[PDB]
Structures are given as C-alpha cells and as structure tokens.
Design a protein around this ligand. Sequence first.
Ligand SMILES: CC(=O)SCCNC(=O)CCNC(=O)[C@H](O)C(C)(C)COP(=O)(O)OP(=O)(O)OC[C@H]1O[C@@H](n2cnc3c(N)ncnc32)[C@H](O)[C@@H]1OP(=O)(O)O
Length: 147
Amino acid sequence: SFTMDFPYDLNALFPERISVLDSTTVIDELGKARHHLYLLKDGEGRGVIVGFLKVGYKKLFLLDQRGAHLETEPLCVLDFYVTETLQRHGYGSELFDFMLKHKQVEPAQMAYDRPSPKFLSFLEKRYDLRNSVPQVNNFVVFAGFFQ
Ligand SMILES: CC(=O)SCCNC(=O)CCNC(=O)[C@H](O)C(C)(C)COP(=O)(O)OP(=O)(O)OC[C@H]1O[C@@H](n2cnc3c(N)ncnc32)[C@H](O)[C@@H]1OP(=O)(O)O
C-alpha cells in the first residue's frame, strides 16, 4: 500500500482521464485538462506526486535532412510535466534518465511531441540536442535520429 497526493496542476494535466469512485461517490477526477507512464513522488514530510512522463511508440511520417519523406515508428515523448512550484529542482531529469536507462534508448533516437520552450531548453542544455530536422507534423526530431 502507498500514499498519493496530486498538486492541483499535475492532477488536471494528467495524461490519463481517470475517475476514482468510492463504494457511489467520486474521490478524484484526473485528466480534465505500446505505452509507458512514469510517476515520481517525494517525502514532503507528508508525501506528494511532483512529475509525470508518458512515452510511447507512434507511427510518424517525417521529412529527413533533405526533405525526403519517410515513415518510422520511434519511441516518443508524449507528455511531460513537473508541478510548477517545484520545477528546476531536478525532478524532470530524474524521470527522464530513468526512462532512458530502462527503455534502453538515447534522446536523439526519440521523437518529441510538441515540445514547449521549457522542454526544448531542457533537452538542449541537459542532452545537447540542438540541431533539429524541420517537420510539419508538430513532432520534433534531432539530427542524430537519422544517424
Ligand atoms: C512532449 C510533451 O510532454 S510537451 C513539453 C511539456 N512542458 C511543459 O508542460 C512546461 C513545463 N513543465 C515541466 O514540468 C518542466 O518545465 C520540464 C518538464 C520541461 C522539466 O522538468 P524540471 O524538473 O523543471 O527540469 P530539471 O530541474 O530536471 O532540469 C533543469 C533544466 O530544465 C530546463 N528548465 C526547467 N524549467 C525552465 C524554465 N522555466 N525556463 C528555462 N528552462 C527551464 C533548463 O534547461 C534547466 O537547465 P538550468 O537549470 O541548467 O538552466
């Protein structure tokens, strides 16, 4: 058994629509705002869930470095969040490094679904992913993806 608290924001942006019922009333609604989801908690001292990371495979139609079309099905980062007040504490790096270690895969080999400015900075500074191959499908892949 274990305890689980969701900050307001992480609770709403949860990448899974979940209704929790009590034998019949509802305890919590998450998500109002081939796959693997990673969650992370901290003793603080009364516990709390601080981040989540969802990755999964997805068939993608991409352009290569010279515009040639091509299909591929890489592991993709689909959702990635750390409750706001606790960003830049290292939690993001924790979740991400675990995922890589166990999925046994490198950042440059992944596609990134609609990364935000914070996530881009995170990828660029922490994993030196800087050179992106332009897409038109809202996924971001870097040069290593094709090498
Ligand atoms: C595919 C999808 O999931 S789309 C992307 C999702 N992004 C969002 O929803 C917005 C923000 N939410 C977040 O949870 C975080 O900002 C994440 C997921 C990007 C990173 O998690 P954090 O725990 O905050 O990152 P962590 O503390 O592990 O590493 C720090 C690095 O992240 C980046 N970072 C985190 N917050 C910021 C910020 N406000 N401005 C700029 N860079 C930031 C920087 O590269 C920073 O490096 P520095 O501290 O050396 O400058």
